[PDB]
Structures are given as C-alpha cells and as structure tokens.
Design a protein around this ligand. Structure first.
Ligand SMILES: [Mg+2]
Ligand SMILES: [Mg+2]
Ligand SMILES: [Mg+2]
Ligand SMILES: [Mg+2]
Ligand SMILES: [Zn+2]
Length: 171
RNA sequence: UGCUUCGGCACAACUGUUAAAAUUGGAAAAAUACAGAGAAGAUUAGCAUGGCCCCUGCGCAAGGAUGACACGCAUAAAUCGAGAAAUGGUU
C-alpha cells in the first residue's frame, strides 16, 4: 500500500513497476497458500525466497547493472518496496548472497551463532550440508556456495538456472 | 565481491526443543445407576478450627451446603490387687 498512497514514484519506476507488482502478487499468493502437509517451519520458506528474489531484482538493477537511480532506489527503500538492510548487506564483503537477515541475527540462534547456512558447505559436516535452515529454507548462502547467483535453497540442485530461480531480464 | 606482485589473499563461519509424526500414556466431562446434606426434637443463620481436600476469584477480600472432610462408632479392657483361706506338702 505504502507506495500506492498519494505520492508519485521517481523516474525509472515504470521499468521496474510491473516486475515489482509481480513479486508482490507472488508474495500475496504465498501468504494465501495452504499449509497442510508440510512442516510448521516451512511456512515462510517461499516467502523468504521470494523476498530474496524481489530485493535481488532491485539489487541487480541498482548495483550490478546500475540502471537504477539513487533517488529511485532510495524511494524503494523508503516506501518499503526494497529491504534496505538486506540489500545493504549484500554489498558487504562476505554477505554477497545472504539469504535473510535472520540468518545472521545472533540473538536468533541458540548458541549465539549465525545460522549453519552462512558456513561454507565444505567446512560443514555431512549432517549440516543437506539440511535447510529451519527459518529461511537456505542450505548455503555462503559466498562461494551460491548456485545461479543466489543461495542454495531447500530445492536447489547441487539442473538449469532457469528452472531454479526467477529470471527477470528485459524483453 | 573487493584487492590484487593476477599466485592468490581478504571477507563471511555451525540452524534446528531437529516431525508434515510415531507412539505414548493420562485426563475433565456426559449419560447411566448409585445414592443424596451440620449442630440438639424439628426447622434453620452462620463464623471458625485442622490439612498430602480442593473449586470460583486479581485477591492477605469474598464465596463454594456453616465448601467439603473430620466429628468418635469411644465393641479407644482407660484394668488388678488384696487377703483369707485354705489347701497343699512335709514332718
Ligand atoms: Mg466458617
Ligand atoms: Mg467460606
Ligand atoms: Mg443456606
Ligand atoms: Mg469450612
Ligand atoms: Zn542462508
């Protein structure tokens, strides 16, 4: 709603508008899915992956292609279209494909750790090498571990890039 | 992803009461049927006491049949010796 009320969005918003609205429609239907037959912990996995992909479109255009304006990006952050903290993180060295801000909240975890998905899949034991995080669904968002430019999510074949992530592009 | 003597460095570092379960057991209630109320004649107000009895209540109130219970039904032997007499052994 926040973007839709009153005000105008800066120049550029017409390029990203349909994609952003598609991502918002996908999140709208993820919230509405049914949860019978899947773990309690996996409720929000699709929401987290979709939130990642949405902010990764905003990130892709703002910092990897740099086709987004500083004022448009600052608008998206201010109007809550972009997760500003998560995109800010992806800029930090070592947090380049971080799956969620939950994964590196350390009060979030029993032993005061980050989550096991932040740990390079090699340095982990076979027990923590195929299990997705219970909150985010990420198996490995350690930079270096990423398939297709993103994390290794619950179902990421360690197939083809097109079958494993949303591929916006500019047709 | 920076930095790169382009060799590689740097950064980043261990989620999960792990189930979409499986058992697993214990529970209040319902009906049924039982049976179904203090004090001394009857009818009745209560306030207590005691505690491995609780319930309602925010309760250091108040209430729950004086909340209940107990409460004795004491077959709680609370028990026995004094002396004369008299009889039994022994001399
Ligand atoms: Mg009383
Ligand atoms: Mg009372
Ligand atoms: Mg009365
Ligand atoms: Mg009483
Ligand atoms: Zn992760």
């Amino acid at each position: 709603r926040r973007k839709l009320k009153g005000k105008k969005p800066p120049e550029g918003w017409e390029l990203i508008e349909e994609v952003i609205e598609d991502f918002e429609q996908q999140l709208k239907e993820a919230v509405n899915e049914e949860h019978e037959g899947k773990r309690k912990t996996e409720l929000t996995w699709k929401i987290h992956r979709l939130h990642w992909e949405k902010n990764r479109f905003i990130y892709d255009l703002m910092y990897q292609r740099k086709v987004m304006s500083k004022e448009l990006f600052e608008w998206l952050v201010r109007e809550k279209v972009a997760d500003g903290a998560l995109i800010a993180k992806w800029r930090k060295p070592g947090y380049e494909i971080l799956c969620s801000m939950l994964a590196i909240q350390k009060g979030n975890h029993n032993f005061g750790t980050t989550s096991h998905c932040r740990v390079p899949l090699r340095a982990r034991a076979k027990q923590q090498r195929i299990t997705p995080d219970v909150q985010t669904g990420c198996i490995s968002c350690a930079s270096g571990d990423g398939k297709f430019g993103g994390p290794v999510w619950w179902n990421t074949p360690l197939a083809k890039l097109e079958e494993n992530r949303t591929t916006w592009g500019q047709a």
